[PDB]
Amino acid sequence: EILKSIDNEWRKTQCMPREVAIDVGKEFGVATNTFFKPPCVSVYRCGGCCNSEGLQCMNTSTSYLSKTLFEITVPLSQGPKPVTISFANHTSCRCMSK
Amino acid sequence: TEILKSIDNEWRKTQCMPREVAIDVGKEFGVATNTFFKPPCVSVYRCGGCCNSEGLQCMNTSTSYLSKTLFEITVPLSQGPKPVTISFANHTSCRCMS
Amino acid sequence: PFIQHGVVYITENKNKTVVIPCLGSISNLNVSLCARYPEKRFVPDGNRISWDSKKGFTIPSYMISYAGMVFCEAKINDESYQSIMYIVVVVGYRIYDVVLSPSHGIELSVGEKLVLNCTARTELNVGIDFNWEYPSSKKLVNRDLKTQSGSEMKKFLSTLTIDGVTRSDQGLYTCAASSGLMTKKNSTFVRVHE
Amino acid sequence: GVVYITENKNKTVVIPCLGSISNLNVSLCARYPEKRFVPDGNRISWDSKKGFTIPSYMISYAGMVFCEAQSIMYIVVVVGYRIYDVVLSPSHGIELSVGEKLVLNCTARTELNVGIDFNWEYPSHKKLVNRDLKTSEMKKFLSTLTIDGVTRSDQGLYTCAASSGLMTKKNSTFVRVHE
Numbered sequence: 001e002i003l004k005s006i007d008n009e010w011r012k013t014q015c016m017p018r019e020v021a022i023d024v025g026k027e028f029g030v031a032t033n034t035f036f037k038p039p040c041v042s043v044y045r046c047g048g049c050c051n052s053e054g055l056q057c058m059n060t061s062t063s064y065l066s067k068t069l070f071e072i073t074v075p076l077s078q079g080p081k082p083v084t085i086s087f088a089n090h091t092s093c094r095c096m097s098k
Numbered sequence: 099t100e101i102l103k104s105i106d107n108e109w110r111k112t113q114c115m116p117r118e119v120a121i122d123v124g125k126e127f128g129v130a131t132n133t134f135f136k137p138p139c140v141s142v143y144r145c146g147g148c149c150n151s152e153g154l155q156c157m158n159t160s161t162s163y164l165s166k167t168l169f170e171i172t173v174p175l176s177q178g179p180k181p182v183t184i185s186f187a188n189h190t191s192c193r194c195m196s
Numbered sequence: 197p198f199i200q201h202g203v204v205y206i207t208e209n210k211n212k213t214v215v216i217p218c219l220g221s222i223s224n225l226n227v228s229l230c231a232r233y234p235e236k237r238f239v240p241d242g243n244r245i246s247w248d249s250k251k252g253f254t255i256p257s258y259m260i261s262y263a264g265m266v267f268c269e270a271k272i273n274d275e276s277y278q279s280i281m282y283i284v285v286v287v288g289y290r291i292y293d294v295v296l297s298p299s300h301g302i303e304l305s306v307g308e309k310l311v312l313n314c315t316a317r318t319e320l321n322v323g324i325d326f327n328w329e330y331p332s333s334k335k336l337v338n339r340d341l342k343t344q345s346g347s348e349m350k351k352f353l354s355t356l357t358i359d360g361v362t363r364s365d366q367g368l369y370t371c372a373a374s375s376g377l378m379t380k381k382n383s384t385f386v387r388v389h390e
Numbered sequence: 391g392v393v394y395i396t397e398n399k400n401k402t403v404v405i406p407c408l409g410s411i412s413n414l415n416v417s418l419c420a421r422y423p424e425k426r427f428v429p430d431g432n433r434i435s436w437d438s439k440k441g442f443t444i445p446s447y448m449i450s451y452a453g454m455v456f457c458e459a460q461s462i463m464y465i466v467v468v469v470g471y472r473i474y475d476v477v478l479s480p481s482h483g484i485e486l487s488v489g490e491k492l493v494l495n496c497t498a499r500t501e502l503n504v505g506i507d508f509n510w511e512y513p514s515h516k517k518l519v520n521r522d523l524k525t526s527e528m529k530k531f532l533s534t535l536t537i538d539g540v541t542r543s544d545q546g547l548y549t550c551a552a553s554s555g556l557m558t559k560k561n562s563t564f565v566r567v568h569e
C-alpha cells in the first residue's frame with residue numbers, strides 16, 4: 001500500500017514513446033516569416049525519466065509519418081498551400097548515456 | 099476532403115489541454131543540494147499543446163493538488179531513503195492566454 | 197443552403213468585426229457559427245453577432261481568433277447543414293521601428309569589410325520582407341531573433357556584408373522592412389577612401 | 391532496502407536477499423523496464439548466505455530490484471562522488487564598511503550523480519541559501535552566504551566546504567571590515 005503508489009509513479013514515468021505536440025516550423029528550422037496551419041502535429045516521441053543522471057531517454061527505432069497541412073507565407077504573397085512533410089514517430093526507447 | 103479529415107485531426111490532437119507528463123521533482127524548486135529523489139519523477143497532468151497565434155501560451159485556469167509519497171536520499175549516506183510527502187500541481191483546465 | 201475550403205483573415209484588433217462569407221439561398225435561415233479547437237458555437241444575439249445571408253456571418257474577431265477553423269451551420273427540419281471550412285489566419289502588420297547598426301559615421305579604407313545590421317521590431321504574427329538600396333555593383337543574410345517572453349514583439353535581422361569595399365561603395369545605404377501592409381526604412385551614409 | 395551502484399560498472403554488486411533454504415532457486419527482477427536475471431553459474435549467482443550477486447551494469451538502469459523464488463524491494467542508487475573544484479566569488483580583496491551587505495558565492499563543480507552538502511566557517515545574522523545550477527559532464531552547486539549589514543566582528547576568514555559523501559574540497563577568503 002505504502003509502496004503500491006511509488007511503483008505506480010515509476011511505471012508511469014518510465015522512458016517510453018509518448019504523444020506530444022511538435023511545432024512544425026521549429027522542428028525544421030523554418031524561417032518564422034512562414035506560417036504553418038496547424039502550427040503543430042501529433043506524433044510520438046521518447047520521453048520520461050531515467051534513474052541515473054547522464055542517462056537520457058532516446059529512440060532506438062523510428063517510423064516516419066507523412067502528414068499534410070497548410071503553409072502561409074507572410075507578407076501575404078498567396079493563400080495557404082498544401083504541403084506534405086514527414087515527421088519522426090519514435091516506436092521504441094531506451095535510457096542511454098552520452 | 100480526405101486531406102481536410104486529417105488536418106482537423108492534427109488540430110484536435112494538438113490543442114491546448116491538460117496532458118500527462120513526467121515532472122522531475124528535484125527541479126520543481128527548493129530542493130536541498132544534498133538530496134536525490136526516488137523516483138526522480140512523478141506523473142501529473144499539465145497544460146500543453148499549441149495555440150494558433152504567437153505570444154499566446156497554453157496556461158492552466160484551474161488547479162487541483164495531489165499528495166504523493168516518495169523516497170528521498172540524502173548525502174552523506176548517514177541514513178537510508180526516507181519517505182517524504184509532497185504536493186504537486188495537477189492542472190484540470192487550460193486556455194490559450196496572452 | 198449555402199452557395200473546397202476558404203480563409204478568414206483576422207486583425208487581432210480586439211473590437212473590429214470579421215465576416216465569414218457563408219452565403220445563403222434562403223434569407224430566412226437560422227445560422228450558427230462553429231469554431232475549433234476547442235469547440236465553440238456562436239449564435240446571433242441580434243446585436244454584435246449576426247447573419248445577413250447576403251453578406252454572411254458577422255462576429256467580433258476576438259471570439260474566434262483562438263480557432264484553427266470555422267464554419268457556418270444551419271438546421272432545417274431535424275437535419276443540419278454546414279458550409280465549407282474556413283481556415284483562420286491571425287496576421288499582424290505593425291512595424292515599430294527599423295534601425296541600422298552601425299547607424300552613422302561609417303568610414304572604411306579600400307579593402308576593408310563592411311558589415312551593416314538592419315533590425316526590425318514588430319508586433320506578433322508579422323512576417324518581414326527586407327529590401328536594400330546601395331551604390332552600384334554584397335551578401336545579404338536574413339534571420340529571426342529571439343525576443344520575449346511577455347515582450348509583445350518580434351525581432352527581425354538583415355545583415356549586409358561587403359567583403360573588401362571599393363571607392364564605388366561610398367554612398368547611401370537604405371534598409372526597408374515590409375510586413376505586407378506597412379513599410380518602414382532607415383539609412384546611413386558610408387564613406388570610403390584610399 | 392537500498393543498493394548502491396558505483397563507478398566501476400563491471401564490478402559486481404550484491405543484493406542481500408538472505409535465504410532460509412540454501413537450496414533455493416532465486417531470480418532477480420528489475421524495473422522499469424521489467425527484466426529477470428537468472429544465475430548462470432558464472433557471473434550471476436545466489437549464495438543464500440550472501441544474497442544475489444550480479445554485475446552492476448545489468449541493473450544500473452533500474453529504479454528498483456528484488457529477489458524472487460518475493461523479498462523486500464530494494465531502491466537502486468547510482469552515486470558519484472568526484473568534486474572538481476570549489477570556488478569563492480568574490481575570491482579576494484573583499485573590503486566593507488560597517489553596515490555594508492556581504493554576499494559570498496560558493497560554487498562546487500562535480501561529476502554526475504553527485505549530491506553536495508555545504509558547510510561554512512566564519513568569525514563568531516548570516517543567512518545561507520543553497521541551490522542547483524543548470525548546465526558538460528558536470529553538475530554545478532551554489533551556496534550563497536549573506537550578511538545583511540556587517541560589523542567589525544565579521545572581519546576574518548570565511549571558509550566554504552563541499553562534501554559529496556566520500557570527498558570534500560573547500561576554499562576560503564579573508565574579509566576585511568573597517569570603521
Ligand SMILES: *[C@@H]1O[C@H](CO)[C@@H](O[C@@H]2O[C@H](CO)[C@@H](O[C@@H]3O[C@H](CO)[C@@H](O)[C@H](O)[C@@H]3O)[C@H](O)[C@H]2NC(C)=O)[C@H](O)[C@H]1NC(C)=O
Nearest residue numbers: 027028029045058059060061062063087088089090091092
Ligand atoms: C531517432 O529519432 C531521430 C528523429 O527525432 C532520428 O534523427 C533524425 O534522423 C534523420 C535521418 O537519419 C535526420 O535527417 C537529416 O536531416 C539533416 C538536416 O537536419 C540532414 O543533414 C540529413 O541529410 C538528413 O536529412 C534528422 O536530422 C535526425 N534528427 C535529428 C538529428 O535530431 C534518428 O534517426 C532516430 N534514431 C534511431 C536509432 O531510431
Ligand SMILES: *[C@@H]1O[C@H](CO)[C@@H](O[C@@H]2O[C@H](CO)[C@@H](O[C@@H]3O[C@H](CO)[C@@H](O)[C@H](O)[C@@H]3O)[C@H](O)[C@H]2NC(C)=O)[C@H](O)[C@H]1NC(C)=O
Nearest residue numbers: 016017018019042043044045063064065088089090091092
Ligand atoms: C507512432 O508510434 C506510436 C507509438 O509507438 C504507435 O502507436 C502504437 O500503435 C501500435 C499499433 O496499433 C499499438 O500496438 C498495439 O499494442 C496493443 C497492446 O496495447 C496490442 O494489443 C495491439 O495488437 C497492437 O499491437 C501500440 O499500442 C501503439 N503504441 C503506443 C505506445 O501507444 C503508432 O504506430 C505510430 N503512430 C501512428 C499514427 O502511426
Ligand SMILES: *[C@@H]1O[C@H](CO)[C@@H](O[C@@H]2O[C@H](CO)[C@@H](O[C@@H]3O[C@H](CO)[C@@H](O)[C@H](O)[C@@H]3O)[C@H](O)[C@H]2NC(C)=O)[C@H](O)[C@H]1NC(C)=O
Nearest residue numbers: 126127128144157158159160161162186187188189190191
Ligand atoms: C496554475 O498552476 C500553477 C502551478 O502549476 C499555480 O501556480 C501556483 O500558485 C500557488 C498559489 O496558489 C503558489 O503557491 C506557492 O506556495 C509556496 C509555499 O508552499 C510559496 O513559496 C509561493 O510563494 C506560492 O505562494 C505556487 O508557487 C504556484 N506554483 C508555481 C511554482 O508557479 C497556479 O495557481 C495555477 N493557476 C491557475 C489559475 O489555476
Ligand SMILES: *[C@@H]1O[C@H](CO)[C@@H](O[C@@H]2O[C@H](CO)[C@@H](O[C@@H]3O[C@H](CO)[C@@H](O)[C@H](O)[C@@H]3O)[C@H](O)[C@H]2NC(C)=O)[C@H](O)[C@H]1NC(C)=O
Nearest residue numbers: 115116117118142143144161162163164187188189190191
Ligand atoms: C488531474 O488532472 C486530470 C486532467 O485534468 C484530471 O482528470 C479528470 O478527472 C475527472 C474526475 O475528477 C474526470 O471527470 C470525469 O469525466 C468523465 C468523462 O470524461 C465523467 O464520466 C465523470 O462523471 C467525470 O466528470 C475527467 O474525465 C478527468 N480528465 C482526464 C481523464 O484527463 C484529474 O481530475 C486531476 N486529478 C485530480 C485528483 O483532481
Ligand SMILES: *[C@H]1O[C@H](CO)[C@@H](O[C@@H]2O[C@H](CO)[C@@H](O[C@@H]3O[C@H](CO)[C@@H](O)[C@H](O)[C@@H]3O)[C@H](O)[C@H]2NC(C)=O)[C@H](O)[C@H]1NC(C)=O
Nearest residue numbers: 473474475476477478479480481482559560561562563564
Ligand atoms: C580555490 O581553490 C581552487 C581549487 O579548489 C583554486 O583553483 C584554481 O583553479 C584555476 C583553474 O585551474 C587555476 O587557474 C590557472 O590558470 C593558469 C593558466 O596558465 C595556470 O596557473 C593553471 O593552468 C590554472 O588553470 C588557479 O590557478 C587555481 N587557484 C588559484 C590560486 O588561482 C581556486 O583558484 C581557489 N580560489 C581562490 C582561493 O581564489
Ligand SMILES: *[C@@H]1O[C@H](CO)[C@@H](O[C@@H]2O[C@H](CO)[C@@H](O)[C@H](O)[C@H]2NC(C)=O)[C@H](O)[C@H]1NC(C)=O
Nearest residue numbers: 292293294295296297299300379380381382383
Ligand atoms: C532610424 O534610426 C534612428 C535611430 O538610429 C531612429 O531615430 C529615433 O527616432 C525617434 C523619433 O522618430 C526618436 O525619438 C529617437 O530618439 C531616435 N533615436 C535616435 C538615436 O536618434 C529612427 O526612428 C529610425 N527610423 C525608423 C523609421 O525607424
Ligand SMILES: *[C@@H]1O[C@H](CO)[C@@H](O[C@@H]2O[C@H](CO)[C@@H](O)[C@H](O)[C@H]2NC(C)=O)[C@H](O)[C@H]1NC(C)=O
Nearest residue numbers: 478479480492493494495496523532533534535
Ligand atoms: C552569486 O550568485 C548569484 C546567482 O548567480 C548572483 O545573483 C545575480 O547577480 C547578478 C549581478 O549582480 C545579477 O545580474 C543577477 O540578476 C543575479 N541573479 C540572481 C538569481 O539573483 C550573484 O551576483 C552572485 N554573487 C557574486 C558576488 O558573485
Ligand SMILES: *[C@@H]1O[C@H](CO)[C@@H](O)[C@H](O)[C@H]1NC(C)=O
Nearest residue numbers: 209210211212213243244256
Ligand atoms: C468595442 O466597440 C464597440 C463598437 O463596435 C463598442 O460599442 C463597445 O463598447 C466596445 N467594447 C467594449 C469594451 O465595451
Ligand SMILES: *[C@@H]1O[C@H](CO)[C@@H](O)[C@H](O)[C@H]1NC(C)=O
Nearest residue numbers: 297298311312313341353355
Ligand atoms: C549584428 O547583429 C547581431 C545580432 O544582434 C550581433 O551579434 C552583431 O554584433 C551585430 N553587428 C553589429 C555591427 O551591430
Ligand SMILES: [Cs+]
Nearest residue numbers: 025032034035
Ligand atoms: Cs511562424
